[PDB]
Amino acid sequence: TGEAIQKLRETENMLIKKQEFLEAKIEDELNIARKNASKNKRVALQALKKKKRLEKQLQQIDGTLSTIEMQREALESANTNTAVLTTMKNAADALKRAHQNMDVDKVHDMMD
């Protein structure tokens, strides 16, 4: 049902924690590199190597997140149309009754 939007959030919301988790570990690795940049090339390079891979995990979480967002915004659209189109036709039904009754009044005059 529309509850699908509920699972799209919470999913999206969990995905932001992953996103904030990576951003966290990225600056973490970065600060390791900073403090070992000149004193310890080995450790510094392991950091930048971990950082570069974390950043990659962040891109495809970003791309995935926006993908999630749009499907939520596609459900929202289709969810409103569901209401709009039912009242839209309900109206055209009522309107057709008006036009129908009119046509029956004319035929009722032919009864003379």
Swiss-Prot record:
Name used for this protein in its record: Charged multivesicular body protein 4
General function of this protein: Probable core polymerisation component of the endosomal sorting required for transport (ESCRT) III complex involved in multiple cellular processes requiring the outward bending of membranes, including vesicle budding, membrane repair and cytokinesis. The ESCRT pathway involves 4 complexes (ESCRT-0, -I, -II and -III) that sequentially assemble on the cytoplasmic side of membranes and induce membrane remodeling, budding and scission.
Keywords: Coiled coil, Endosome
Disruption phenotype: Lethal late in embryogenesis. Dendritic arborization neurons have dramatically reduced dendritic field sizes but increased dendritic branching. Increased ectopic axonal branching. Conditional RNAi-mediated knockdown in germline stem-cells (GSCs) of the germarium delays or prevents abscission during GSC division resulting in multi-cell cysts that share a cytoplasm and undergo synchronous cell division. Conditional RNAi-mediated knockdown in germline stem cells (GSCs) of the germarium produces egg chambers with 32 germline cells instead of 16.
Compartments, record wording: Endosome; Endosome, Multivesicular body; Midbody
Coiled coil: 5-71
Organism whose genome encodes this protein: Drosophila melanogaster
Additional observations: Some multidendritic neurons possess extensive and intricate dendrite outgrowth known as dendritic arborization that resemble trees when imaged by microscopy. Mutant larvae possess less extensive and smaller arborization patterns giving the name Shrub.
Subunit description: Homopolymer; forms elongated striated filaments of uniform ~10nm width. Monomers interact in a staggered arrangement mediated by complementary charged electrostatic surfaces. Interacts with l(2)gd1 (via DM14 domains 1 and 3); the interaction is direct and blocks access to the surface involved in homopolymerization. This interaction may be required for the ESCRT-III complex role in multivesicular body formation.
Main location per the UniProt record: other
Similarity comment: Belongs to the SNF7 family.
Keyword Membrane: no
Record GO biological process: autophagy; dendrite morphogenesis; endosome transport via multivesicular body sorting pathway; female germ-line stem cell asymmetric division; late endosome to vacuole transport via multivesicular body sorting pathway; mitotic cytokinesis; neuron remodeling; symbiont entry into host cell
Tissues with expression: Expressed at considerably higher levels in testis than in ovary. Expressed in midgut, eye, mouthparts and male accessory gland.
Result when mutating E69K: Unable to rescue null mutant phenotype, probably due to disruption of electrostatic interactions required for homopolymerization
Source superkingdom: Eukaryota
Any Gene Ontology CC annotation: ESCRT III complex
